[PDB]
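## retry 2 of 3
previous attempt timed out at serialization; input unchanged, resubmitting
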Amino acid sequence: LRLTPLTVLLRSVLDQLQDKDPARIFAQPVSLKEVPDYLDHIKHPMDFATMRKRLEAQGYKNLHEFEEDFDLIIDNCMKYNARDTVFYRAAVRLRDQGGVVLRQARREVDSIGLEEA
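## retry succeeded, writing output
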């Protein structure tokens, strides 16, 4: 595979984000069989599986595109599920924990920026 440095970084980000989701709540697209009204509430479903697929096709051109999809995962869960639920709580935990990681990722895109030269 002919991997760009952004992709390598984003994969490390993405793996770390998944590491914080041990229950695999956001690992895969929501099932419509399991949630038939989902698209009444959510305009743009997103999950880590779909992000990895875009990543592995080197379909992120910048960190900003990656963060937008990560935000969707979080925001969709909070819009669909009540504050009272496990899905909502995990999403908050993952948002907080992943903020740390994405903030680290921004520093690192800048760091690589400095290496040249």
